[PDB]
Amino acid sequence: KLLEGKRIIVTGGAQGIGASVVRAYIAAGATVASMDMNDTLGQQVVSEAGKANPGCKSRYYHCNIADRPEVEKAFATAAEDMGGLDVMVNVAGVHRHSPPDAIAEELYDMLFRVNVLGTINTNAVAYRLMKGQGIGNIINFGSESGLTGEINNALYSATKAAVHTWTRNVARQWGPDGIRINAVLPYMVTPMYVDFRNALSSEDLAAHDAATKTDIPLGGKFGDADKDLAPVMVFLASDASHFMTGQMFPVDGGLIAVR
Amino acid sequence: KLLEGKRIIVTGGAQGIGASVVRAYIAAGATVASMDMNDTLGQQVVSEAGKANPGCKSRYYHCNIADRPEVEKAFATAAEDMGGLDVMVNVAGVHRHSPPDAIAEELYDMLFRVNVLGTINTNAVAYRLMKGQGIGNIINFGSESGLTGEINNALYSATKAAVHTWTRNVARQWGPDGIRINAVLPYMVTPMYVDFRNALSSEDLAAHDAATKTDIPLGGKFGDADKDLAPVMVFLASDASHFMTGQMFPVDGGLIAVR
Amino acid sequence: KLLEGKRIIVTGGAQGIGASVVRAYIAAGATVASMDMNDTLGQQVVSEAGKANPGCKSRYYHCNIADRPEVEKAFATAAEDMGGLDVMVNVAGVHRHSPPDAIAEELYDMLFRVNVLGTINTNAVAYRLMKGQGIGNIINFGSESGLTGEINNALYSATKAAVHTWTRNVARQWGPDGIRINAVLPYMVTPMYVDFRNALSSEDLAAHDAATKTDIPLGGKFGDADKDLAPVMVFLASDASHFMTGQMFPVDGGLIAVR
Amino acid sequence: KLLEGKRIIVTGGAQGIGASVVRAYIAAGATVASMDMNDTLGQQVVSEAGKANPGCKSRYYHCNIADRPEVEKAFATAAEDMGGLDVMVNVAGVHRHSPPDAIAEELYDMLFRVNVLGTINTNAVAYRLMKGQGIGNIINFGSESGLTGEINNALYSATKAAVHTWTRNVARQWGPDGIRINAVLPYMVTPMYVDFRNALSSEDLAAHDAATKTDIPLGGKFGDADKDLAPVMVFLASDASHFMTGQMFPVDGGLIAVR
C-alpha cells in the first residue's frame, strides 16, 4: 500500500474534504490520527473507514486547532500512540461569504482564527514533533480563492492567501531541518456546495452549471473528493513528494493555473 | 501640480513611509487628510510639510484603523472638510519578526488586526464614501514579503499576502462602481531599518550590504521614500492610473518581480 | 511637459498602439524617433502628431526589428540625431490566431521572429547605446495572453510569455548598469479588434460585449489607447518610474491581475 | 506496478533527464517508446533499462521533434506498436548561455526551434493521436529559468517561459477533449551540470556550493533524477494526476515557488 506504516495526523476529519482524506489515507495503509471538534461525526468517519479496511490502525482525537495548548497536547498524544509523526495534514477550515464592505469584526476574527491561526498552530506543533527525526511532511489546505477569489468572498480569499504565503515562507525556513511544506488547492463537491446548489432556483442552477462547465476545462464539473482528490493526497503524503516544498497543488480540473 | 485639488486620505501619516506619502501629496498640490494614532508626530509631519508648501490645505485626524466606528467617523469628517473623497491610501501597518514555530496568539492577533482588519475597515469605509460619485481610488500597502518573505518573518509575510489578494478581489467587485484598488510594494529606508542597521556588528552589516547589493539590481541599496517612492505614489493617486486595478506595484529597484 | 527633452525611440509607430505611443510622447514634449516598416503610414503618424504640437522634434526611421544590422544602424542614427538615447519602447509585434494543433512552421517562425527576436534585438541595441551613460529605460510590450491566453491563441500567448520572462531576466542583468526594463500589458481598441467586431454577426457581437462587460471590471469595455494607455506610457517613460524594473504593468481595467 | 500497461512516448530519451524518465517508466511497468536523435545512446538507454527489468516492452525511435513530419510518422509508428497512446512526455531540449546583448540570430533560432517548436509539434501530434479516445496526458518540461532565470541565461529562460504559457493555454483548449497538459520544472544533476562543476576552479566551486546550499532549502544540493525526480514523473504519468491540468510542478527542493 502506498502509505504503509506512515504515521499521519489529519485535522478536520469529521466532514467533507477532511473526511475524504482520512478515508483515503486509511485505505492507503497509513496509521491515521483524525482530529476535529465534532467528536461524534469525527469518530463515525474513522469507524466507517475502518469497516472498509479491517485491521487498520486509527484513532480520533478532539482538537481545536485555534487553541495552541490543545494542539500541543492532542498532537503529542497522537504521536505517542503512533510511535512518531511522519505527516500532518491541516484540512480544518471555515467558509463564509460577505460583501467586502460589510464585514463585522467578529466575522473577520473567526475566519482568520480558524483558517490562519489554525494553520500556524498545527504547523508549529508538527514542526517541533518532526524536527528531531530530520524529516517531516506538512500539507496545508489553500484555495483557488487565495489567488483572487469570488464576488462576496474577499474575506475567505484573504485567509487562504495567507496560508499560501505562510506555506512558501516556512518551506524555506524548515527545509534545512528536512521538513517539506506544501499547499493543496481543491475544487470538490462538499456538503456546503450541495446545500448551495439545493437552494438555487432552476434558473440560477442552470446558469451556475453552464458557467462551471466553461470554467473547468477537464469535465466541466466540481470534482469528487474520493475519486479526484484522494490520489493526489496520497502522492503528497507519500515519499514520492520528498523533493517538492513550498508549492501549491491545484486539484481542480484546470479551474486556475499557478504562475 | 499633478494632484491639484485631489481630496486624499492617508493613514499612517505620522512616520516612515506614511509620512513620506503625506509630504509627497502635499507637495503635489493635493488636499491631504493625514491620519494616525500618534497625534503629536502626525501633526508635526503635516505642519512641516506645510512649511515647505505655504498655503496648502491639510489636516491631521486621530484614527485607529482597526476600529471601524472610528474609521467611519474620522473618514466622514475628513470628507466633509474636503468636500468629498477622491483617494484613500492605507499606509498604517505593523512589523514584527518571529520564528514561525513560536508565535504567541497575542502576536498573531496584533499583526492581523492592524495589517488586515485595518485594510478591510479603511477600504470598506472609503468605498462607501466614494460609491455615490461613481469613481474612486484606493491604494493599499502590500509588501515583497507577501510573495514569500524572509526567515523569521512568516507572520508578517502572511498578513501582506492577505492584503494582496484582498486588493485583487475587491478590485473585481468594486470596479463596476468605478472604484480602482491597487497595492504598492515598497523597499525603502525606514526608521526600523535604520535601527536594524545600527544594532548590527560591523561584520553583520558588511554581510547585509553585500547581500543587499546583489539582491537589488538597480543601485544595490534600499530606496529613499522621498526620491524613489514619492513619484510612483503621485502617479497612482493621479488620474493617470485610472485604467489599472487589482495590481501590485513593486518600487524596490528590482528586488522582486510580479508574475 | 512630463517628458520634456527626453530622447525616445518607439518601434511600431505606424499604426495602432505604437502610433498612440508616438502621439502621447510627442504631446508630452519628448523628442521622438518613430520606427516601423510601413514608411508612408509611419511618417503620416509623425506628421499628424506634429500638427497638434507645433515645433516638436521628431523623425521617422525605417527599421525591421527582426534584422539586428538594421536595428543597429537605425538606432545609432536616431541617437545621433537626438544627441543620445533615454528611452526605447518596443511596440512592434504581430498577432495571428491558430488552433494549437495546426500551427505551420512558417507561422511559428514569423510570430517568434517579430515578437521575440525583435524584442531581443531592440533591447540589445538600446542597452549598448545606453550603457555608457549609466542610465536607461527600456519598455517592452507584453500581453495578458502571455499569462495564459485565449482559445486558438496559444502561439501568440507563448511569444508574449517569452517577452515577459526576457524582461524580468535582463532587468536583473542590466540593473547594475543603471538600465531599467519593464513590460506593458495593454487591453485597448485596435484596428484588428475593430475588424474582428465588424465581421461578427449581431448575435456573436452581443455575446462578446456581454462577456467583455463581465471580464473587465472597470467599464466593461476595451480601453482607448489615447485616453487610458497614454498616461501610463508617459509615467513609464518619465523619471518617475526610475525605481521599478522587471515588472509587468496591466493597463486593462482589471482584465487580469499580476501575482 | 504504478504504470502497468501505460503506453508512453518519451522524447529526449538518450541522455540526462530524458534517460532517467525512460528508466523510471520502464521500472514502473510502462510500455515505453523512447525517442531521440542520438540513436546509439538512445538504444543503449533502452537496452540497459531492459536489463534491470527483464521482459519489459520498449522500443527506441529516431525522431527530430523540430520536424513535424518526422514527429507525425514516429509517433504514429509508436502508437501502432503499443496499440495506442496514453502519455507523451517531451523532455528533449537544448541549453546554451549567452550575454543577452550578444545573441546571434542562429543561436536564437536553435533554442526556440528545439525548446518551443519541438514542444508545439510533439504536443500537437500527441493531441491528435489521443483525442479519439477521449483521454490523454501530455507532460512538458519547463524550467525554473522560465520564471525569471539566471545571469547570461535570458534566451533559455525565454524559451521555457513560452513552454509554461503554452502548457497553460492548451490545457484550457484540450481539457474538454479529456487531455491534460502539465509542465515539470526539475533541478537535477545532469551531464552538463557535472561538466560545469568540473571546469571551475576550487574557489568558484566552493562559492557555487555555498550559494546552492542557501538557494535549495531541502538538502542544499541539486537533486538526483533517479531518486528525486522519478517518483514525481511516475505520479504525473499515472492516473493519480487525472484532475490536474495546466500546472507547473517544481521538483527542486524548494529552489523556486509557484504563485
Side-chain angles (χ1 to χ4, degrees):
Chain A
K1 307 219 227 207
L2 298 181
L3 296 189
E4 187 66 35
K6 291 280 171 210
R7 295 162 303 187
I8 311 182
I9 282 174
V10 182
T11 72
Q15 65 275 303
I17 296 323
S20 78
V21 177
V22 170
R23 289 198 294 276
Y25 287 178
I26 288 179
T31 293
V32 179
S34 161
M35 324 201 163
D36 209 293
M37 281 180 81
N38 292 332
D39 299 342
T40 301
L41 223 44
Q43 175 69 55
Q44 186 177 298
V45 165
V46 164
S47 287
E48 285 307 308
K51 283 193 206 174
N53 304 276
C56 65
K57 189 179 184 182
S58 195
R59 188 172 190 199
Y60 173 77
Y61 314 68
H62 180 89
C63 186
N64 181 350
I65 66 166
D67 189 273
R68 180 138 179 184
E70 216 169 298
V71 177
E72 290 182 350
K73 177 168 151 209
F75 281 23
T77 299
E80 178 184 48
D81 285 341
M82 300 192 289
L85 180 58
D86 301 312
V87 185
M88 196 282 307
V89 183
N90 186 51
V91 201
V94 296
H95 305 246
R96 247 302 312 255
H97 284 71
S98 175
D101 67 316
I103 297 161
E105 189 279 350
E106 187 193 53
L107 183 49
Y108 149 80
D109 185 81
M110 170 200 318
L111 255 71
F112 274 86
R113 177 163 320 274
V114 174
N115 295 356
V116 182
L117 186 50
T119 292
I120 295 175
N121 291 341
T122 63
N123 282 207
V125 175
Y127 169 70
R128 292 207 184 158
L129 286 166
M130 303 165 159
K131 180 172 196 191
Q133 72 196 8
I135 181 153
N137 189 351
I138 298 169
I139 300 168
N140 292 326
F141 269 67
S143 174
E144 50 85 14
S145 304
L147 307 177
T148 289
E150 304 78 2
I151 290 292
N152 297 328
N153 212 21
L155 181 64
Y156 176 81
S157 300
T159 67
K160 294 305 195 167
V163 167
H164 295 176
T165 291
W166 167 265
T167 296
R168 286 193 280 275
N169 188 288
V170 306
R172 311 204 80 72
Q173 178 130 17
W174 299 341
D177 301 320
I179 316 304
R180 64 186 178 280
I181 311 100
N182 296 289
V184 182
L185 283 60
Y187 211 55
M188 308 280 142
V189 172
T190 63
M192 112 195 94
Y193 175 59
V194 169
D195 282 354
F196 160 83
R197 286 183 64 93
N198 290 338
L200 296 178
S201 62
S202 64
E203 195 165 320
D204 287 7
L205 190 67
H208 166 80
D209 285 347
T212 302
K213 193 194 189 174
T214 297
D215 292 352
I216 306 177
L218 286 175
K221 298 170 182 202
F222 277 58
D224 178 83
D226 296 347
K227 186 182 160 83
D228 306 317
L229 179 62
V232 180
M233 295 306 293
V234 168
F235 159 78
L236 290 167
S238 83
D239 289 344
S241 70
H242 78 269
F243 212 54
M244 308 181 73
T245 192
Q247 320 295 338
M248 291 179 303
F249 298 81
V251 190
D252 62 8
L255 180 78
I256 57 79
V258 298
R259 299 209 304 266
Chain B
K1 307 219 227 207
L2 298 181
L3 296 189
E4 187 66 35
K6 291 280 171 210
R7 295 162 303 187
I8 311 182
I9 282 174
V10 182
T11 72
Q15 65 275 303
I17 296 323
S20 78
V21 177
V22 170
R23 289 198 294 276
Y25 287 178
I26 288 179
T31 293
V32 179
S34 161
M35 324 201 163
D36 209 293
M37 281 180 81
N38 292 332
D39 299 342
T40 301
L41 223 44
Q43 175 69 55
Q44 186 177 298
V45 165
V46 164
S47 287
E48 285 307 308
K51 283 193 206 174
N53 304 276
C56 65
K57 189 179 184 182
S58 195
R59 188 172 190 199
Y60 173 77
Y61 314 68
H62 180 89
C63 186
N64 181 350
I65 66 166
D67 189 273
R68 180 138 179 184
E70 216 169 298
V71 177
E72 290 182 350
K73 177 168 151 209
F75 281 23
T77 299
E80 178 184 48
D81 285 341
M82 300 192 289
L85 180 58
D86 301 312
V87 185
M88 196 282 307
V89 183
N90 186 51
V91 201
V94 296
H95 305 246
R96 247 302 312 255
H97 284 71
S98 175
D101 67 316
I103 297 161
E105 189 279 350
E106 187 193 53
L107 183 49
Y108 149 80
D109 185 81
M110 170 200 318
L111 255 71
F112 274 86
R113 177 163 320 274
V114 174
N115 295 356
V116 182
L117 186 50
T119 292
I120 295 175
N121 291 341
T122 63
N123 282 207
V125 175
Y127 169 70
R128 292 207 184 158
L129 286 166
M130 303 165 159
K131 180 172 196 191
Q133 72 196 8
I135 181 153
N137 189 351
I138 298 169
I139 300 168
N140 292 326
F141 269 67
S143 174
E144 50 85 14
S145 304
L147 307 177
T148 289
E150 304 78 2
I151 290 292
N152 297 328
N153 212 21
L155 181 64
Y156 176 81
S157 300
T159 67
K160 294 305 195 167
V163 167
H164 295 176
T165 291
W166 167 265
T167 296
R168 286 193 280 275
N169 188 288
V170 306
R172 311 204 80 72
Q173 178 130 17
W174 299 341
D177 301 320
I179 316 304
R180 64 186 178 280
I181 311 100
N182 296 289
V184 182
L185 283 60
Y187 211 55
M188 308 280 142
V189 172
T190 63
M192 112 195 94
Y193 175 59
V194 169
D195 282 354
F196 160 83
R197 286 183 64 93
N198 290 338
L200 296 178
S201 62
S202 64
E203 195 165 320
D204 287 7
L205 190 67
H208 166 80
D209 285 347
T212 302
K213 193 194 189 174
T214 297
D215 292 352
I216 306 177
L218 286 175
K221 298 170 182 202
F222 277 58
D224 178 83
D226 296 347
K227 186 182 160 83
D228 306 317
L229 179 62
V232 180
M233 295 306 293
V234 168
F235 159 78
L236 290 167
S238 83
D239 289 344
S241 70
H242 78 269
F243 212 54
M244 308 181 73
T245 192
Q247 320 295 338
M248 291 179 303
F249 298 81
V251 190
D252 62 8
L255 180 78
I256 57 79
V258 298
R259 299 209 304 266
Chain C
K1 307 219 227 207
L2 298 181
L3 296 189
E4 187 66 35
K6 291 280 171 210
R7 295 162 303 187
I8 311 182
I9 282 174
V10 182
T11 72
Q15 65 275 303
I17 296 323
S20 78
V21 177
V22 170
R23 289 198 294 276
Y25 287 178
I26 288 179
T31 293
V32 179
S34 161
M35 324 201 163
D36 209 293
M37 281 180 81
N38 292 332
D39 299 342
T40 301
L41 223 44
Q43 175 69 55
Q44 186 177 298
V45 165
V46 164
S47 287
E48 285 307 308
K51 283 193 206 174
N53 304 276
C56 65
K57 189 179 184 182
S58 195
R59 188 172 190 199
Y60 173 77
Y61 314 68
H62 180 89
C63 186
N64 181 350
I65 66 166
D67 189 273
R68 180 138 179 184
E70 216 169 298
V71 177
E72 290 182 350
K73 177 168 151 209
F75 281 23
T77 299
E80 178 184 48
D81 285 341
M82 300 192 289
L85 180 58
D86 301 312
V87 185
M88 196 282 307
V89 183
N90 186 51
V91 201
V94 296
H95 305 246
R96 247 302 312 255
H97 284 71
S98 175
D101 67 316
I103 297 161
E105 189 279 350
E106 187 193 53
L107 183 49
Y108 149 80
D109 185 81
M110 170 200 318
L111 255 71
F112 274 86
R113 177 163 320 274
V114 174
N115 295 356
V116 182
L117 186 50
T119 292
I120 295 175
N121 291 341
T122 63
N123 282 207
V125 175
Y127 169 70
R128 292 207 184 158
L129 286 166
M130 303 165 159
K131 180 172 196 191
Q133 72 196 8
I135 181 153
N137 189 351
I138 298 169
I139 300 168
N140 292 326
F141 269 67
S143 174
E144 50 85 14
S145 304
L147 307 177
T148 289
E150 304 78 2
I151 290 292
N152 297 328
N153 212 21
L155 181 64
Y156 176 81
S157 300
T159 67
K160 294 305 195 167
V163 167
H164 295 176
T165 291
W166 167 265
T167 296
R168 286 193 280 275
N169 188 288
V170 306
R172 311 204 80 72
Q173 178 130 17
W174 299 341
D177 301 320
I179 316 304
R180 64 186 178 280
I181 311 100
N182 296 289
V184 182
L185 283 60
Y187 211 55
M188 308 280 142
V189 172
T190 63
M192 112 195 94
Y193 175 59
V194 169
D195 282 354
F196 160 83
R197 286 183 64 93
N198 290 338
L200 296 178
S201 62
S202 64
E203 195 165 320
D204 287 7
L205 190 67
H208 166 80
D209 285 347
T212 302
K213 193 194 189 174
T214 297
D215 292 352
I216 306 177
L218 286 175
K221 298 170 182 202
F222 277 58
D224 178 83
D226 296 347
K227 186 182 160 83
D228 306 317
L229 179 62
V232 180
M233 295 306 293
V234 168
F235 159 78
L236 290 167
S238 83
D239 289 344
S241 70
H242 78 269
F243 212 54
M244 308 181 73
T245 192
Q247 320 295 338
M248 291 179 303
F249 298 81
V251 190
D252 62 8
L255 180 78
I256 57 79
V258 298
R259 299 209 304 266
Chain D
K1 307 219 227 207
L2 298 181
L3 296 189
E4 187 66 35
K6 291 280 171 210
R7 295 162 303 187
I8 311 182
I9 282 174
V10 182
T11 72
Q15 65 275 303
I17 296 323
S20 78
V21 177
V22 170
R23 289 198 294 276
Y25 287 178
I26 288 179
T31 293
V32 179
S34 161
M35 324 201 163
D36 209 293
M37 281 180 81
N38 292 332
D39 299 342
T40 301
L41 223 44
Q43 175 69 55
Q44 186 177 298
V45 165
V46 164
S47 287
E48 285 307 308
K51 283 193 206 174
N53 304 276
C56 65
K57 189 179 184 182
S58 195
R59 188 172 190 199
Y60 173 77
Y61 314 68
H62 180 89
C63 186
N64 181 350
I65 66 166
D67 189 273
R68 180 138 179 184
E70 216 169 298
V71 177
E72 290 182 350
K73 177 168 151 209
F75 281 23
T77 299
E80 178 184 48
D81 285 341
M82 300 192 289
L85 180 58
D86 301 312
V87 185
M88 196 282 307
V89 183
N90 186 51
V91 201
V94 296
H95 305 246
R96 247 302 312 255
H97 284 71
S98 175
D101 67 316
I103 297 161
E105 189 279 350
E106 187 193 53
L107 183 49
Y108 149 80
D109 185 81
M110 170 200 318
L111 255 71
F112 274 86
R113 177 163 320 274
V114 174
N115 295 356
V116 182
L117 186 50
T119 292
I120 295 175
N121 291 341
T122 63
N123 282 207
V125 175
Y127 169 70
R128 292 207 184 158
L129 286 166
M130 303 165 159
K131 180 172 196 191
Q133 72 196 8
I135 181 153
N137 189 351
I138 298 169
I139 300 168
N140 292 326
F141 269 67
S143 174
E144 50 85 14
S145 304
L147 307 177
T148 289
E150 304 78 2
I151 290 292
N152 297 328
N153 212 21
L155 181 64
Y156 176 81
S157 300
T159 67
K160 294 305 195 167
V163 167
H164 295 176
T165 291
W166 167 265
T167 296
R168 286 193 280 275
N169 188 288
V170 306
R172 311 204 80 72
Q173 178 130 17
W174 299 341
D177 301 320
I179 316 304
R180 64 186 178 280
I181 311 100
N182 296 289
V184 182
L185 283 60
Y187 211 55
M188 308 280 142
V189 172
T190 63
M192 112 195 94
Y193 175 59
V194 169
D195 282 354
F196 160 83
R197 286 183 64 93
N198 290 338
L200 296 178
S201 62
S202 64
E203 195 165 320
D204 287 7
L205 190 67
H208 166 80
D209 285 347
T212 302
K213 193 194 189 174
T214 297
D215 292 352
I216 306 177
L218 286 175
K221 298 170 182 202
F222 277 58
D224 178 83
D226 296 347
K227 186 182 160 83
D228 306 317
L229 179 62
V232 180
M233 295 306 293
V234 168
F235 159 78
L236 290 167
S238 83
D239 289 344
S241 70
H242 78 269
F243 212 54
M244 308 181 73
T245 192
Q247 320 295 338
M248 291 179 303
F249 298 81
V251 190
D252 62 8
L255 180 78
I256 57 79
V258 298
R259 299 209 304 266

